[PDB]
Amino acid sequence: MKQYLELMQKVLDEGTQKNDRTGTGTLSIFGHQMRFNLQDGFPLVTTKRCHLRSIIHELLWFLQGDTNIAYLHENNVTIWDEWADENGDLGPVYGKQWRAWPTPDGRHIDQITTVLNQLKNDPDSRRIIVSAWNVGELDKMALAPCHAFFQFYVADGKLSCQLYQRSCDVFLGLPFAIASYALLVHMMAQQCDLEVGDFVWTGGDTHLYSNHMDQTHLQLSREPRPLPKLIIKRKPESIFDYRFEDFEIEGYDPHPGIKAPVAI
Template sequence: MKQYLELVSHVIQNGTKQANRTGINTISFPGAMLRFDLQEGFPAITTRKMAFKSAIGEMCGFLRGVNNAAEFRALGCKVWDQNANENAQWLANPFRQGDDDLGEIYGVQWRKWPAYKQIPLSNTAAIEQTLSNGYKQIAQGEEDGQAYVVLYKAIDQVRQCVDTIIKDPGSRRILFHGWNVAQLDEMALPPCHLLYQFHPNVETKEISLTLYIRSNDLGLLYPLEESAQYAMAA
């Protein structure tokens, strides 16, 4: 808590005022970082009353790939209700699929990141390799006189991370991402915490996690359900 309050003070004293889409100016200080050792306690750092059950329900929803406010409510989390049903911009979005729909938010990208490959029909080796990796052909077309096929696969990024931690813990590629540029317009809210990298230590049998947040209300800092290390762009 001490380092958090010191950071809040530092941002207030050294940050710069900036206008943004909400119409309420912010005091911004990019690139700040907080570090937590889980052996010293759970990093639930906030200046307000913490709705712990709601935070756990939300995380369970993300890990299940939930994209519907009703499913979050069933898990004890109501924080997505307003984004789903009261956000004027989202209500007018043609991608919205009725009440409680949230679109392709966090958990969808974590567990079912949509991956497409367009491969020339003449490149049979690449097509065969892609099919062997679980992709399915969904379309065929022609561009500049060259025939091609389109293959698709929903990628479970979290599962890939778990598998790599087990099989290749020395890898520096154990990460997953929520910022899918191609689908930002299909989300009720684009991800704030968006990049997560695991750092296993084989010798000590510990795992650190670096979390990058593109935007966060530092004064009301969210409970940190999952991070051992927490990198924040305020």
């Protein structure tokens, strides 16, 4: 993608040296915003081949309020194994906070149902937010939420969504964050009979790890290909009723995969 390759160059040209939590160096810029009109095509990176199946299985896990690695494992998805303990528990991360924010008075708040109720009944709200940054439970979480917070917006039957991402690995982590949330705008939109608007990504500490320089330099050598088209085959009874088989990406012809290694 263009907005994305523009950011990569930016972290290289403008980024300061800064360190990882007692680890690797980074080139760090703070605060950046990109916009994706989702009507122009689905924002899956074409400059390295990304695989959507992990993304999908992860989102449907989140919407189930699920926080144990069992679902992912039953479908060979291994992207949260690192964080899990022996029992597969990740603590009260995303899925638990999206579907059951614990109140001090004993309730569990379903932020995803609230959000659909708002988009359906009060589409002009400025409060259509869902949040994962619960300060009360940050000590129990496997890691603190990267995609801390997001907000929905409705103007002219188009639904947009802004995500704030407190920490971003531009190389590995950002193609995945964009495809995951952009998918959710499409599912949300379908459920509310709204057209898709814009995905706006806003980040805090946006970085490139020092040992991904070669791989970035290679990705910047590639001209972006046309964005693919996301088709959803079925209209489920609700947002908690979508299946992996429901989505297909048409016309995705990326350049090859690039791997990027991490220190331990």
